[PDB]
């Protein structure tokens, strides 16, 4: 309560920015896959864009959302230009890490993790 | 199906626990004599809503919320669990 | 006499102390807790909303020609609710004096930029953001300057582990440099070196 | 003073050797496990026990600044012989 | 202007810590115990904040102790318990607090060592 | 044999004589394939159809809350009462104390140093027994 | 169970998995990926090698400090095998060449050596021994390579019972000899095929799926006397498979009929080269052998690996065969091949 705003009067207004940033990515996946020779197809590239958004769909603070949008635009600027190469873009897909299990019994078999 | 052990929670000084604490000093002595092999695992905490947890044959726990129930009102509440 | 203890030129303590008060009553709306240290260096604490008026004043005013921005650092202090204490070191080249200006911030309380006043801030101004996550208003470019293009983090925050959360290695399965969670071969050995005795009684904090 | 373990591997002065069934022995295949053959337990014992006149005798490495910090031993014990803590030298009286 | 926000402050997504270290991790807020070998009390007075210890194993090559987590070495100091709690909740870690254990003032009198009829009489000096 | 973890290797709640629940905290991960004591019973359940409810440790503390609230209260002591009722039920039985002198097992210091699996396995404690008797 | 072998860590580098392994084909094409998946986790891979120390250089990655140990050996010379399979727990034998050399026949690379590795491992006291054959390793076959592997598969098992016989289909990958072969037919104006490629069915499998299968074969408590067949999905028709290779590699496609008797003799000519021949009489027959169905064997799904379709991971290898004006094209513009259950 009683916290100054940052580019957001209320959550709904900040949701428009997120929807503006999503339209910037969806229009951009088909240009990165070609401009830098990625091994993915555009259909599955847009899926990862959507996935990276549902990762942060539970937030409700207007200030936090604006900072998330600000970072996303920076993440988009480094991709609109080829500042970040194939090594960085393919880092989101996690094509090497072993899928960490969820079942307690599988966790119990390997490691001391909770 | 068949009751295996009861356990009761209550506070020391909380007014809500009144009736559970008045219950023990009158009716606890009689009951344990009536059911020698039925552990009534009464436990006394600091701040907690009084409860009457009951344990049955297989994995099964039925509980009540006997908060602000008079001393006699607890007598019927637990007598229900026995029968 | 005392070859070990530093010579103390007390003249420059009076001059700074007079100027700190002069700045205090010529800009009351923002100035908080001006102070002068043993080492004769002035220190002015400013409400974050007054960064532009204070920095613009201390540059243009005839009696305070602080035109050179030495640096724009940031100290993380998790103890205080407003963690990030942005620091501005300034230099005069006219009166041959250095003045520090301090404001507080927070991971959700950005601060107005200064590139309008001091263009030197521009790169320093991102360095704070890249290292501390202190968003700055009205900056032109405002992107990461130091960290990799894919750090989802802010390294200099005290809550960031020293080794980091990710390591880079080369993989033939994918024929490119990949990122995996860090598994150090020898864990960093944190040395508990603090002595249990009051080294400095002049800074005692009663309970 | 190096002794070979039953698996043929060489035991170091710290007493270590890898068991016959340990997989970590692979690193020595086609190479060698270097061990220092000048042990420290044996060499220090071969020195003679010095005899002095006082009941308290100093010990340093010998060169002064090139030795070890200046320490003082007590030689009242007769059943045992006083030992310098830094270097393993020994002292007696009489 | 100002905004109304009743939701608890929550910045877990901004710091960018992996999810594997947000839910599972446990934080301990405590005042470190005085090293009983020494009789100084300066190590105390500052609330600390460690993290739950994790697996450490001998490296197969040298016997060094190797780890798979980055948070183990991190300790943060706070002036008061309340400030530490805000940091823990603010970053989403689970926390448990151990209350301060300050020694109880004791009545030491040199004269009790030499008492005519009490049992405090010290048999030596 | 299902290897567990020692008291220095797992977060566990021990209640002492006063009734004051206290919490161990992990210092070293258990050696080899050993796992936490409560994890084995949870895993052993899942192989069968018993499927114990709680998954991680924090849920087990919730279970301890239901069984006995005092256990989860760390470094807090409950002002127990109602000793009158226990005494009244005690007097009812008609057993007679045996006419044989009662002697504690620990009469001499040599019996102190070996009283548990941990102490028995240690070689320092075995040195003390050798020194005391000799 | 020595305390060192016990697994440790969250899985990755600088970890321990107790998979001390001797891979006898690390320098090759499949061996590169097997070592990677062993070294990506915590495994001390012993890599016997006879090549130059330069050709094994690329393998000094994909493994933490001292998780690799390189030893020299000669297949003819005994007592260099035992020196390498002594302390290992699992021995992975990937030895195999697709042509005869002056010193080594197919008998001496698919039958003799696996026997020497197998006999030297059973006496040494290893727990597992993973062997690789071909899916079309029937005794009643036409290729000289496939028939020899049939005998080696039986001879390996007789000396070393409870072996794991892996039977991959034609493996495709970055530095492979399947997609990099057909794509290289452009240097001749057309792509010769037998019966235009009809009546022949291929079931290619990705290397990483194969290497994941091999790596999980040294963990799963079962699969200690079983025989697998890593085939992968989408049994294409050779005409449709090669037509698709040129679909990704935007070059051309001019198939024409060619009898197998002429197309073998021409292949036999390329086998005379002292260097690695481009084609050989034995490689002609392998490319033109229908792949049996996987019905009567466990396969990948029964082991914990998801087969990866060719369409997904074909552009990674066929990009280098494109030319400018077609290097930036994507997977969308290829009209993928048609599967056939024939
Ligand atoms: N399409 C495929 O790739 C198929 C592969 N397989 C099996 O996969 C395994 C390897 O496949 P791939 O790696 O692609 O074939 P490679 O020829 O690429 O692997 C060759 C490996 O075997 C070693 N090798 C070959 N001959 C000898 C020899 N006479 N003495 C010692 N070492 C030798 C090579 O060592 P150097 O590097 O010194 O030659 C190299 O390490 C083989 O067993 C093969 O049968 C199964 C079905 C099909
Ligand atoms: Zn000495």
mmCIF file with all atom_site columns, C-alpha atoms in Angstrom, chain F:
data_model
loop_
_atom_site.group_PDB
_atom_site.id
_atom_site.type_symbol
_atom_site.label_atom_id
_atom_site.label_alt_id
_atom_site.label_comp_id
_atom_site.label_asym_id
_atom_site.label_entity_id
_atom_site.label_seq_id
_atom_site.pdbx_PDB_ins_code
_atom_site.Cartn_x
_atom_site.Cartn_y
_atom_site.Cartn_z
_atom_site.occupancy
_atom_site.B_iso_or_equiv
_atom_site.pdbx_formal_charge
_atom_site.auth_seq_id
_atom_site.auth_comp_id
_atom_site.auth_asym_id
_atom_site.auth_atom_id
_atom_site.pdbx_PDB_model_num
ATOM 1   C CA . UNK F 1 1   ? 19.372 -53.174 5.744  1.00 0.00 ? 1   UNK F CA 1
ATOM 2   C CA . UNK F 1 2   ? 18.248 -49.681 4.720  1.00 0.00 ? 2   UNK F CA 1
ATOM 3   C CA . UNK F 1 3   ? 20.949 -47.162 5.676  1.00 0.00 ? 3   UNK F CA 1
ATOM 4   C CA . UNK F 1 4   ? 19.734 -44.016 7.381  1.00 0.00 ? 4   UNK F CA 1
ATOM 5   C CA . UNK F 1 5   ? 21.517 -40.828 8.372  1.00 0.00 ? 5   UNK F CA 1
ATOM 6   C CA . UNK F 1 6   ? 22.992 -39.890 11.730 1.00 0.00 ? 6   UNK F CA 1
ATOM 7   C CA . UNK F 1 7   ? 21.913 -36.970 13.901 1.00 0.00 ? 7   UNK F CA 1
ATOM 8   C CA . UNK F 1 8   ? 24.562 -34.734 12.288 1.00 0.00 ? 8   UNK F CA 1
ATOM 9   C CA . UNK F 1 9   ? 23.270 -35.445 8.784  1.00 0.00 ? 9   UNK F CA 1
ATOM 10  C CA . UNK F 1 10  ? 19.552 -34.609 8.782  1.00 0.00 ? 10  UNK F CA 1
ATOM 11  C CA . UNK F 1 11  ? 17.040 -32.109 10.117 1.00 0.00 ? 11  UNK F CA 1
ATOM 12  C CA . UNK F 1 12  ? 15.145 -33.916 12.869 1.00 0.00 ? 12  UNK F CA 1
ATOM 13  C CA . UNK F 1 13  ? 13.019 -32.933 15.855 1.00 0.00 ? 13  UNK F CA 1
ATOM 14  C CA . UNK F 1 14  ? 14.187 -34.442 19.146 1.00 0.00 ? 14  UNK F CA 1
ATOM 15  C CA . UNK F 1 15  ? 12.232 -33.895 22.357 1.00 0.00 ? 15  UNK F CA 1
ATOM 16  C CA . UNK F 1 16  ? 14.329 -33.888 25.524 1.00 0.00 ? 16  UNK F CA 1
ATOM 17  C CA . UNK F 1 17  ? 13.335 -34.732 29.095 1.00 0.00 ? 17  UNK F CA 1
ATOM 18  C CA . UNK F 1 18  ? 11.833 -31.300 29.780 1.00 0.00 ? 18  UNK F CA 1
ATOM 19  C CA . UNK F 1 19  ? 9.565  -31.757 26.767 1.00 0.00 ? 19  UNK F CA 1
ATOM 20  C CA . UNK F 1 20  ? 11.354 -28.973 24.869 1.00 0.00 ? 20  UNK F CA 1
ATOM 21  C CA . UNK F 1 21  ? 11.355 -29.846 21.180 1.00 0.00 ? 21  UNK F CA 1
ATOM 22  C CA . UNK F 1 22  ? 14.598 -28.939 19.419 1.00 0.00 ? 22  UNK F CA 1
ATOM 23  C CA . UNK F 1 23  ? 15.739 -29.128 15.809 1.00 0.00 ? 23  UNK F CA 1
ATOM 24  C CA . UNK F 1 24  ? 18.917 -30.614 14.441 1.00 0.00 ? 24  UNK F CA 1
ATOM 25  C CA . UNK F 1 25  ? 20.182 -29.069 11.222 1.00 0.00 ? 25  UNK F CA 1
ATOM 26  C CA . UNK F 1 26  ? 22.191 -30.588 8.412  1.00 0.00 ? 26  UNK F CA 1
ATOM 27  C CA . UNK F 1 27  ? 25.958 -30.355 8.757  1.00 0.00 ? 27  UNK F CA 1
ATOM 28  C CA . UNK F 1 28  ? 27.171 -33.089 6.394  1.00 0.00 ? 28  UNK F CA 1
ATOM 29  C CA . UNK F 1 29  ? 25.251 -35.084 3.821  1.00 0.00 ? 29  UNK F CA 1
ATOM 30  C CA . UNK F 1 30  ? 25.069 -38.789 4.726  1.00 0.00 ? 30  UNK F CA 1
ATOM 31  C CA . UNK F 1 31  ? 27.728 -41.029 3.176  1.00 0.00 ? 31  UNK F CA 1
ATOM 32  C CA . UNK F 1 32  ? 27.236 -43.401 0.295  1.00 0.00 ? 32  UNK F CA 1
ATOM 33  C CA . UNK F 1 33  ? 23.658 -44.159 -0.695 1.00 0.00 ? 33  UNK F CA 1
ATOM 34  C CA . UNK F 1 34  ? 22.237 -43.460 2.770  1.00 0.00 ? 34  UNK F CA 1
ATOM 35  C CA . UNK F 1 35  ? 19.069 -41.365 2.842  1.00 0.00 ? 35  UNK F CA 1
ATOM 36  C CA . UNK F 1 36  ? 17.084 -39.509 5.468  1.00 0.00 ? 36  UNK F CA 1
ATOM 37  C CA . UNK F 1 37  ? 15.210 -41.712 7.914  1.00 0.00 ? 37  UNK F CA 1
ATOM 38  C CA . UNK F 1 38  ? 11.751 -40.384 7.069  1.00 0.00 ? 38  UNK F CA 1
ATOM 39  C CA . UNK F 1 39  ? 12.359 -40.522 3.307  1.00 0.00 ? 39  UNK F CA 1
ATOM 40  C CA . UNK F 1 40  ? 12.771 -44.300 3.399  1.00 0.00 ? 40  UNK F CA 1
ATOM 41  C CA . UNK F 1 41  ? 9.363  -44.850 4.996  1.00 0.00 ? 41  UNK F CA 1
ATOM 42  C CA . UNK F 1 42  ? 7.819  -42.489 2.447  1.00 0.00 ? 42  UNK F CA 1
ATOM 43  C CA . UNK F 1 43  ? 9.542  -44.298 -0.425 1.00 0.00 ? 43  UNK F CA 1
ATOM 44  C CA . UNK F 1 44  ? 8.764  -47.689 1.101  1.00 0.00 ? 44  UNK F CA 1
ATOM 45  C CA . UNK F 1 45  ? 5.111  -46.646 1.121  1.00 0.00 ? 45  UNK F CA 1
ATOM 46  C CA . UNK F 1 46  ? 5.003  -45.725 -2.565 1.00 0.00 ? 46  UNK F CA 1
ATOM 47  C CA . UNK F 1 47  ? 6.296  -49.118 -3.706 1.00 0.00 ? 47  UNK F CA 1
ATOM 48  C CA . UNK F 1 48  ? 3.282  -50.634 -1.971 1.00 0.00 ? 48  UNK F CA 1
ATOM 49  C CA . UNK F 1 49  ? -0.155 -49.047 -2.302 1.00 0.00 ? 49  UNK F CA 1
ATOM 50  C CA . UNK F 1 50  ? 0.029  -47.305 1.067  1.00 0.00 ? 50  UNK F CA 1
ATOM 51  C CA . UNK F 1 51  ? 1.055  -43.971 -0.548 1.00 0.00 ? 51  UNK F CA 1
ATOM 52  C CA . UNK F 1 52  ? 1.818  -41.914 2.533  1.00 0.00 ? 52  UNK F CA 1
ATOM 53  C CA . UNK F 1 53  ? 0.419  -38.396 1.948  1.00 0.00 ? 53  UNK F CA 1
ATOM 54  C CA . UNK F 1 54  ? 3.230  -35.958 2.739  1.00 0.00 ? 54  UNK F CA 1
ATOM 55  C CA . UNK F 1 55  ? 6.016  -35.630 0.163  1.00 0.00 ? 55  UNK F CA 1
ATOM 56  C CA . UNK F 1 56  ? 8.724  -33.352 1.592  1.00 0.00 ? 56  UNK F CA 1
ATOM 57  C CA . UNK F 1 57  ? 9.932  -32.459 5.076  1.00 0.00 ? 57  UNK F CA 1
ATOM 58  C CA . UNK F 1 58  ? 7.803  -29.360 5.647  1.00 0.00 ? 58  UNK F CA 1
ATOM 59  C CA . UNK F 1 59  ? 4.679  -31.478 5.168  1.00 0.00 ? 59  UNK F CA 1
ATOM 60  C CA . UNK F 1 60  ? 5.940  -33.985 7.741  1.00 0.00 ? 60  UNK F CA 1
ATOM 61  C CA . UNK F 1 61  ? 6.135  -31.150 10.270 1.00 0.00 ? 61  UNK F CA 1
ATOM 62  C CA . UNK F 1 62  ? 2.487  -30.461 9.456  1.00 0.00 ? 62  UNK F CA 1
ATOM 63  C CA . UNK F 1 63  ? 1.740  -34.105 10.241 1.00 0.00 ? 63  UNK F CA 1
ATOM 64  C CA . UNK F 1 64  ? 3.578  -33.769 13.555 1.00 0.00 ? 64  UNK F CA 1
ATOM 65  C CA . UNK F 1 65  ? 1.329  -30.794 14.314 1.00 0.00 ? 65  UNK F CA 1
ATOM 66  C CA . UNK F 1 66  ? -1.783 -32.972 14.128 1.00 0.00 ? 66  UNK F CA 1
ATOM 67  C CA . UNK F 1 67  ? -0.348 -35.886 16.114 1.00 0.00 ? 67  UNK F CA 1
ATOM 68  C CA . UNK F 1 68  ? 1.122  -33.656 18.828 1.00 0.00 ? 68  UNK F CA 1
ATOM 69  C CA . UNK F 1 69  ? 1.248  -29.838 18.624 1.00 0.00 ? 69  UNK F CA 1
ATOM 70  C CA . UNK F 1 70  ? 4.106  -29.588 21.123 1.00 0.00 ? 70  UNK F CA 1
ATOM 71  C CA . UNK F 1 71  ? 6.651  -31.266 18.834 1.00 0.00 ? 71  UNK F CA 1
ATOM 72  C CA . UNK F 1 72  ? 6.555  -28.532 16.186 1.00 0.00 ? 72  UNK F CA 1
ATOM 73  C CA . UNK F 1 73  ? 6.984  -25.780 18.805 1.00 0.00 ? 73  UNK F CA 1
ATOM 74  C CA . UNK F 1 74  ? 10.767 -25.382 18.806 1.00 0.00 ? 74  UNK F CA 1
ATOM 75  C CA . UNK F 1 75  ? 12.533 -24.253 21.984 1.00 0.00 ? 75  UNK F CA 1
ATOM 76  C CA . UNK F 1 76  ? 9.178  -23.839 23.741 1.00 0.00 ? 76  UNK F CA 1
ATOM 77  C CA . UNK F 1 77  ? 8.092  -25.717 26.862 1.00 0.00 ? 77  UNK F CA 1
ATOM 78  C CA . UNK F 1 78  ? 4.499  -26.629 27.669 1.00 0.00 ? 78  UNK F CA 1
ATOM 79  C CA . UNK F 1 79  ? 3.359  -25.965 31.241 1.00 0.00 ? 79  UNK F CA 1
ATOM 80  C CA . UNK F 1 80  ? 1.928  -29.439 31.686 1.00 0.00 ? 80  UNK F CA 1
ATOM 81  C CA . UNK F 1 81  ? -0.542 -30.142 34.482 1.00 0.00 ? 81  UNK F CA 1
ATOM 82  C CA . UNK F 1 82  ? -3.147 -32.763 35.438 1.00 0.00 ? 82  UNK F CA 1
ATOM 83  C CA . UNK F 1 83  ? -0.775 -34.853 37.524 1.00 0.00 ? 83  UNK F CA 1
ATOM 84  C CA . UNK F 1 84  ? -3.669 -35.454 39.926 1.00 0.00 ? 84  UNK F CA 1
ATOM 85  C CA . UNK F 1 85  ? -5.528 -37.605 37.405 1.00 0.00 ? 85  UNK F CA 1
ATOM 86  C CA . UNK F 1 86  ? -2.467 -39.712 36.586 1.00 0.00 ? 86  UNK F CA 1
ATOM 87  C CA . UNK F 1 87  ? -1.821 -40.285 40.288 1.00 0.00 ? 87  UNK F CA 1
ATOM 88  C CA . UNK F 1 88  ? -5.434 -41.293 40.927 1.00 0.00 ? 88  UNK F CA 1
ATOM 89  C CA . UNK F 1 89  ? -5.300 -43.897 38.156 1.00 0.00 ? 89  UNK F CA 1
ATOM 90  C CA . UNK F 1 90  ? -1.889 -45.013 39.432 1.00 0.00 ? 90  UNK F CA 1
ATOM 91  C CA . UNK F 1 91  ? -3.194 -45.863 42.912 1.00 0.00 ? 91  UNK F CA 1
ATOM 92  C CA . UNK F 1 92  ? -5.814 -48.213 41.443 1.00 0.00 ? 92  UNK F CA 1
ATOM 93  C CA . UNK F 1 93  ? -3.349 -50.945 40.474 1.00 0.00 ? 93  UNK F CA 1
ATOM 94  C CA . UNK F 1 94  ? -2.455 -53.533 43.124 1.00 0.00 ? 94  UNK F CA 1
ATOM 95  C CA . UNK F 1 95  ? 1.166  -54.360 42.304 1.00 0.00 ? 95  UNK F CA 1
ATOM 96  C CA . UNK F 1 96  ? 3.901  -54.651 44.929 1.00 0.00 ? 96  UNK F CA 1
ATOM 97  C CA . UNK F 1 97  ? 7.450  -53.381 44.462 1.00 0.00 ? 97  UNK F CA 1
ATOM 98  C CA . UNK F 1 98  ? 9.919  -56.257 44.399 1.00 0.00 ? 98  UNK F CA 1
ATOM 99  C CA . UNK F 1 99  ? 11.915 -56.955 47.559 1.00 0.00 ? 99  UNK F CA 1
ATOM 100 C CA . UNK F 1 100 ? 15.218 -56.565 45.701 1.00 0.00 ? 100 UNK F CA 1
ATOM 101 C CA . UNK F 1 101 ? 17.584 -53.570 45.949 1.00 0.00 ? 101 UNK F CA 1
ATOM 102 C CA . UNK F 1 102 ? 17.526 -51.286 42.921 1.00 0.00 ? 102 UNK F CA 1
ATOM 103 C CA . UNK F 1 103 ? 20.959 -50.512 41.477 1.00 0.00 ? 103 UNK F CA 1
ATOM 104 C CA . UNK F 1 104 ? 21.524 -48.265 38.440 1.00 0.00 ? 104 UNK F CA 1
ATOM 105 C CA . UNK F 1 105 ? 23.502 -49.847 35.597 1.00 0.00 ? 105 UNK F CA 1
ATOM 106 C CA . UNK F 1 106 ? 25.941 -46.908 35.654 1.00 0.00 ? 106 UNK F CA 1
ATOM 107 C CA . UNK F 1 107 ? 27.773 -47.312 38.961 1.00 0.00 ? 107 UNK F CA 1
ATOM 108 C CA . UNK F 1 108 ? 31.332 -46.555 37.816 1.00 0.00 ? 108 UNK F CA 1
ATOM 109 C CA . UNK F 1 109 ? 32.771 -44.218 35.204 1.00 0.00 ? 109 UNK F CA 1
ATOM 110 C CA . UNK F 1 110 ? 33.852 -47.125 32.994 1.00 0.00 ? 110 UNK F CA 1
ATOM 111 C CA . UNK F 1 111 ? 30.196 -47.802 32.146 1.00 0.00 ? 111 UNK F CA 1
ATOM 112 C CA . UNK F 1 112 ? 29.626 -44.189 31.053 1.00 0.00 ? 112 UNK F CA 1
ATOM 113 C CA . UNK F 1 113 ? 31.716 -44.161 27.875 1.00 0.00 ? 113 UNK F CA 1
ATOM 114 C CA . UNK F 1 114 ? 29.911 -47.055 26.112 1.00 0.00 ? 114 UNK F CA 1
ATOM 115 C CA . UNK F 1 115 ? 26.134 -46.627 26.037 1.00 0.00 ? 115 UNK F CA 1
ATOM 116 C CA . UNK F 1 116 ? 25.086 -46.311 22.380 1.00 0.00 ? 116 UNK F CA 1
ATOM 117 C CA . UNK F 1 117 ? 25.979 -47.408 18.869 1.00 0.00 ? 117 UNK F CA 1
ATOM 118 C CA . UNK F 1 118 ? 27.763 -44.139 18.073 1.00 0.00 ? 118 UNK F CA 1
ATOM 119 C CA . UNK F 1 119 ? 29.922 -44.157 21.196 1.00 0.00 ? 119 UNK F CA 1
ATOM 120 C CA . UNK F 1 120 ? 30.585 -47.887 20.871 1.00 0.00 ? 120 UNK F CA 1
ATOM 121 C CA . UNK F 1 121 ? 31.919 -47.471 17.336 1.00 0.00 ? 121 UNK F CA 1
ATOM 122 C CA . UNK F 1 122 ? 34.205 -44.576 18.278 1.00 0.00 ? 122 UNK F CA 1
ATOM 123 C CA . UNK F 1 123 ? 37.863 -45.238 19.028 1.00 0.00 ? 123 UNK F CA 1
ATOM 124 C CA . UNK F 1 124 ? 38.345 -42.204 21.275 1.00 0.00 ? 124 UNK F CA 1
ATOM 125 C CA . UNK F 1 125 ? 35.695 -43.462 23.679 1.00 0.00 ? 125 UNK F CA 1
ATOM 126 C CA . UNK F 1 126 ? 37.330 -46.895 23.599 1.00 0.00 ? 126 UNK F CA 1
ATOM 127 C CA . UNK F 1 127 ? 40.620 -45.275 24.600 1.00 0.00 ? 127 UNK F CA 1
ATOM 128 C CA . UNK F 1 128 ? 38.976 -43.749 27.666 1.00 0.00 ? 128 UNK F CA 1
ATOM 129 C CA . UNK F 1 129 ? 37.576 -47.081 28.861 1.00 0.00 ? 129 UNK F CA 1
ATOM 130 C CA . UNK F 1 130 ? 41.042 -48.589 28.482 1.00 0.00 ? 130 UNK F CA 1
ATOM 131 C CA . UNK F 1 131 ? 42.582 -45.708 30.436 1.00 0.00 ? 131 UNK F CA 1
ATOM 132 C CA . UNK F 1 132 ? 40.003 -45.660 33.234 1.00 0.00 ? 132 UNK F CA 1
ATOM 133 C CA . UNK F 1 133 ? 40.058 -49.381 34.039 1.00 0.00 ? 133 UNK F CA 1
ATOM 134 C CA . UNK F 1 134 ? 43.860 -49.473 33.776 1.00 0.00 ? 134 UNK F CA 1
#
